[PDB]
Structure 1
């Protein structure tokens, strides 16, 4: 009960970076949302670890696309933006 939202809100964005059925629309809002939504108990810092764990092995991390999520999805948060994302460099 912590890394559920994770997906509920960014499924289309992780799909996007590993090469699946995203980011279309649901990602940008899911994203803008998450930036502003994952501010309950620090969620994105929890998310980080969830990301890290799948990332761990994943499919085709197109980090360029990932680092392009924010620019593409008007969510302007510095959010670390990296393969094995560290929770300590998020905002």
Structure 2
């Protein structure tokens, strides 16, 4: 999957991952859309690598807030996410 596209889907989550109120509906929709598009193993792994690279470039990233996005947005994942998630097993 294209990192530019991934970036566009989650861009609305920025304010929240930086400590602001949220997650907004636009953030959740982007995440749901990404979840709906990254289906094959390659795409999940690709999307994972992308998000980890994007997250590492955010100043004052709040990992606690970023981690709670899936559960707060209603997207159930069989695991917890973090900056050190192994993308080869997602």
Structure 1 equivalent of residue 54 of structure 2? 54
Structure (1 or 2) with the greater helix fraction = 2
CA distance in 1, matches of 2:67, 2:56: 18
Relative to structure 1, the CA distance from residue 56 to residue 71 in structure 2 (aligned partners, 3 Å threshold; closer, same or farther) is: closer
Relative to structure 1, the CA distance from residue 31 to residue 20 in structure 2 (aligned partners, 3 Å threshold; closer, same or farther) is: same
Structure 1 equivalent of residue 31 of structure 2? 31
Q: 1:70·1:76 contact (CA, 8 Å) conserved in 2?
A: yes
RMSD of the alignment, in Å? 2.7
Unaligned runs of 5+ in 1: none
Unaligned runs of 5+ in 2: none
Q: TM-score if structure 1 supplies the norm length?
A: 0.72
Greater relative contact order (Cα 8 A, min sep 6): structure 1 or 2? 2
SS in 1 for 2:3: coil
Q: TM-score if structure 2 supplies the norm length?
A: 0.73
Corresponding position: 1:7 with 2:7 = yes
Q: How many pairs were matched up?
A: 89
